Amino acid sequence: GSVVIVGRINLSGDTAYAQQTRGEEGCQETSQTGRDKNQVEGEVQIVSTATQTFLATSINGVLWTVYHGAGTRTIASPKGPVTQMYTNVDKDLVGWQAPQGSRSLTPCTCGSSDLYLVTRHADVIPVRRRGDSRGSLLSPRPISYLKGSAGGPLLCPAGHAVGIFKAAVSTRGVAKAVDFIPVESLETTMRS
Ligand SMILES: CC[C@@H]1C[C@]1(NC(=O)[C@@H]1C[C@@H]2CN1C(=O)[C@H](C(C)(C)C)NC(=O)OCC(C)(C)CCCCc1cccc3c1CN(C3)C(=O)O2)C(=O)NS(=O)(=O)C1CC1
Numbered sequence: 102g103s104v105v106i107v108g109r110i111n112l113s114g115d116t117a118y119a120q121q122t123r124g125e126e127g128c129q130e131t132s133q134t135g136r137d138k139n140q141v142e143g144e145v146q147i148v149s150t151a152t153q154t155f156l157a158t159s160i161n162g163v164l165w166t167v168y169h170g171a172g173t174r175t176i177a178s179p180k181g182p183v184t185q186m187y188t189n190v191d192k193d194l195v196g197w198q199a200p201q202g203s204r205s206l207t208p209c210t211c212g213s214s215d216l217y218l219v220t221r222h223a224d225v226i227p228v229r230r231r232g233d234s235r236g237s238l239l240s241p242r243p244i245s246y247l248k249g250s251a252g253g254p255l256l257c258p259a260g261h262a263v264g265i266f267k268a269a270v271s272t273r274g275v276a277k278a279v280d281f282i283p284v285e286s287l288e289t290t291m292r293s
């Protein structure tokens with residue numbers, strides 16, 4: 102089965118919003134065939150397999166997401182199923198060549214420690230960077246609130262890509278910190 106784009110998180114306006122482009126029946130069918138003729142736009146896609154739904158984010162012309170969501174699956178596209186360009190299970194990372202029509206987030210060079218995590222419901226959650234791949238949640242959210250947002254972007258105050266959300270440190274169902282694949286690690290994967 103292919104990963105299928107079923108919506109987007111629009112970030113170009115004053116407030117973020119989620120848009121649905123495909124339902125359950127459409128997603129199941131598109132997954133089997135791997136032929137998706139829908140127009141792609143924006144930076145953050147909402148994606149699904151048959152069993153899970155999550156996010157994918159374009160950075161440096163590659164559409165990235167989490168391995169624990171996508172496995173080694175192809176992504177459905179206009180020309181049929183497209184094989185993964187990158188697969189790094191140790192980083193919980195996969196990527197495909199960004200679909201035609203998509204736009205990529207610019208890598209952050211600010212070195213800012215105030216970050217912003219975008220969820221699949223288009224919430225923008227402030228995150229304080231605490232290391233290479235960690236940020237603490239200033240204001241926590243329960244785990245159920247963040248569920249399905251893996252593969253989404255962490256952004257800097259200027260709206261650059263800082264990383265890809267992959268996991269949350271859960272304490273009794275509440276997330277106090279988030280873990281992410283930094284953009285620099287994405288670049289390293291693209292290099293060597
Ligand atoms: C709920 C919002 C979370 C973002 C999110 N991710 C998850 O739910 C991932 C999936 C799974 C568990 N997990 C966790 O976040 C767990 C948790 C909360 C369940 C308790 N936390 C944790 O382990 O902290 C420990 C920590 C050290 C921070 C992990 C670092 C990563 C270590 C690591 C390295 C290499 C490979 C792999 C891992 C972990 N890995 C494979 C893997 O499969 O993890 C999600 O929403 N997923 S989703 O619903 O969209 C799903 C459909 C895609």
Ligand SMILES: [Zn+2]
Nearest residue numbers: 209211257261
């Ligand atoms: Zn920046």
